[PDB]
Amino acid sequence: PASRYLTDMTLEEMSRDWSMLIPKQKVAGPLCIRMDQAIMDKNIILKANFSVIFDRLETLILLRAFTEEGAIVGEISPLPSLPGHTAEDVKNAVGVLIGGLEANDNTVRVSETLQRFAWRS
């Protein structure tokens, strides 16, 4: 107490508005997954912001999928009910998005922060 945040996004990236040409949305536990169904054939990078506590990545604040050119085409966010999630919830929601984008022929990569979070639980 209190918490800090490690993030892959500039302050602009996590504040910017975005919308989906073809809006797809799915609830996975306490988290909302959105991805633009229209996006295809792109190289995508998943970037997250995590609360950091006791030097441990603690909880997902925001995840977004960016194309190589910086466009937001996917989002993972907790429900405003503020239902608290677990690291498995997160890893689960994340694979759902990955699968969603690879359906459309997008090559998906994850950030170093997520690469590390995968194995930290």
Residue numbers in the entry: 85 to 205
Sentences from the paper on this structure:
During infection the influenza A virus NS1 protein participates in multiple protein-RNA and protein-protein interactions to perform a plethora of functions. Present models of the tertiary and quaternary structures of NS1 indicate that the protein possesses two globular domains, each capable of forming independent homodimeric interactions. Our bioinformatic analyses indicate that the N-terminal RBD forms a very stable homodimer, while the predominant and ubiquitous helix-helix contacts between C-terminal EDs bear many similarities with weak transient interfaces.
Previous studies using recombinant Alb/76 and Ud/72 EDs have shown that a single W187A amino-acid substitution is sufficient to prevent dimerization. However, as the strand-strand dimer has never been observed in structures from these strains, it may be that the PR8 ED behaves differently. We therefore introduced the W187A mutation into the PR8 NS1 ED bacterial expression construct. Furthermore, the rationally-designed ‘helix-open’ NS1 protein (W187A) was poor at binding synthetic dsRNA, perhaps indicating that ED helix-helix dimeric interactions allosterically increase affinity of the RBD for dsRNA, or that ED homotypic interactions facilitate oligomerization of NS1 and thus cooperative binding to dsRNA.
